[PDB]
Design a protein around this ligand. Structure first.
Ligand SMILES: O=C(Nc1cccc(C(F)(F)F)c1)C1CCN(c2ncnc3[nH]cnc23)CC1
Ligand SMILES: [Zn+2]
Length: 289
C-alpha cells in the first residue's frame, strides 16, 4: 500500500493563494504516477472551522466529486489530511480559465459560445444526477484542459481572496435571484447561471450589472431582460428561457434537466455523442496558442 504524504509532491509553481490556503502545480516524485503533474490545494483546517457555512455540506460535495468520472468535470484524485492541513490532489489543467478567452476575444461568435455552453450543459446534467448544484458559472469558474475542452473546477469552499456566509464573496453577477435572496433554491439556479454566462459570451458583459453591489442585486432581482437586436433568434430564445425570475419555469428546471436545454434549437448542430467523446474541435487550442 502506498503511503501518500505531502513529501510525495515537489512544488513547481503557485497557481493561487487566499485566506483558506494555497494551490500549487506539483510533480509526484514517488509511487505509481512518478513524474506526473497535478494541481495540489493546501487548505488550513484552522481557517476552515472559522470561516464556514456548513462543513458537512462542502465535505459531502467533495465526497461525491472525488467519485465523479466525466470528461467535463475536474478529477479530484486524492484527498488527505496531515498536520493541520487538508490536501486535495487534482488533475492539472493547463488551458487557463474561460475568462481569459473571453478577455482576449471580447465577445464570442455564436458557434464558439455554443461549443462551450454545450459541453458545460453535459457537465451540469451529470452533476445534478450525482446530487451537486454548481451555483456559479462565472467564466473564471470554468477551466480548459490542454485540448481546449471544458472542465468545471469550482466546488466546495469559497476560493475568493477578498471575502464578505460566502454567497456574496466575489462577483454575484452570474448567480440566480433566489440564491441572492436566500429564499431557497435547487438545480434551476445552474440553468440561470448558464444563461448569464451565455449573455456575457455574446454581448461582453453579464445580463444585470450595476454601478455598485446594491444596484447590481436590485437589477438581478428585477430581472428585466434586455435582448440585443444583433443576436440570432435562437440565442435570444434560449436566453429568455434561462434568465427567468420564476426558477421552476426555466428551461432545464423540469424533469428532463439538461435534456431540456440540449434540445433547444440553439444547439441544433451539436452531435452530443461526439461532443462527450471530445471528438468536436474546440474553438481554441491552448497548446497551439
Ligand atoms: O483553487 C483555486 N484558487 C484558490 C485561490 C485561493 C485559495 C484557494 C484555496 F484555499 F482553496 F486553496 C484556491 C483555483 C482552481 C482552479 N485552478 C487550477 N489550475 C490548474 N489545474 C487545476 N486543476 C484543478 N483546478 C486547477 C487554479 C486555481
Ligand atoms: Zn468567501
Amino acid at each position: 500500500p502506498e503511503k501518500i504524504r505531502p513529501e510525495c509532491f515537489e512544488l513547481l509553481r503557485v497557481l493561487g493563494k487566499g485566506g483558506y490556503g494555497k494551490v500549487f502545480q506539483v510533480r509526484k516524485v514517488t509511487g505509481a504516477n512518478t513524474g506526473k503533474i497535478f494541481a495540489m490545494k493546501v487548505l488550513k483546517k484552522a481557517m476552515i472551522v472559522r470561516n464556514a457555512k456548513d462543513t458537512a455540506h462542502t465535505k459531502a460535495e467533495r465526497n461525491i466529486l472525488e467519485e465523479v468520472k466525466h470528461p467535463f468535470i475536474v478529477d479530484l484524485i486524492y484527498a488527505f489530511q496531515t498536520g493541520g492541513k487538508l490536501y486535495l490532489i487534482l488533475e492539472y489543467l493547463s488551458g487557463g480559465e474561460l475568462f481569459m478567452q473571453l478577455e482576449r476575444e471580447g465577445i464570442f461568435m455564436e458557434d464558439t459560445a455554443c461549443f462551450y455552453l454545450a459541453e458545460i450543459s453535459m457537465a451540469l446534467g451529470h452533476l445534478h444526477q450525482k446530487g451537486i448544484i454548481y451555483r456559479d458559472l462565472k467564466p473564471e469558474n470554468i477551466m480548459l484542459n490542454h485540448q481546449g475542452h471544458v472542465k468545471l473546477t469550482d466546488f466546495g469552499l469559497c476560493k475568493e481572496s477578498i471575502h464578505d456566509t460566502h454567497t456574496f464573496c466575489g462577483t454575484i453577477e452570474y448567480m440566480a435571484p433566489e440564491i441572492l435572496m436566500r429564499s431557497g433554491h435547487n438545480r434551476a439556479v445552474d440553468w440561470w447561471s448558464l444563461g448569464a454566462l451565455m449573455y456575457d459570451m455574446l454581448t461582453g458583459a453579464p445580463p444585470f450589472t450595476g454601478e455598485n453591489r446594491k444596484k447590481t442585486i436590485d437589477k438581478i432581482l428585477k430581472c428585466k431582460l434586455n435582448l440585443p437586436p444583433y443576436l440570432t433568434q435562437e440565442a435570444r430564445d434560449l436566453l429568455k428561457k434561462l434568465l427567468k425570475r420564476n426558477a421552476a419555469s426555466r428551461l432545464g428546471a423540469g424533469p428532463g434537466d439538461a435534456g431540456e436545454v440540449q434540445a433547444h434549437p440553439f444547439f441544433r448542430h451539436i452531435n452530443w455523442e461526439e461532443l462527450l467523446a471530445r471528438k468536436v474541435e474546440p474553438p481554441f487550442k491552448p497548446l497551439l496558442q
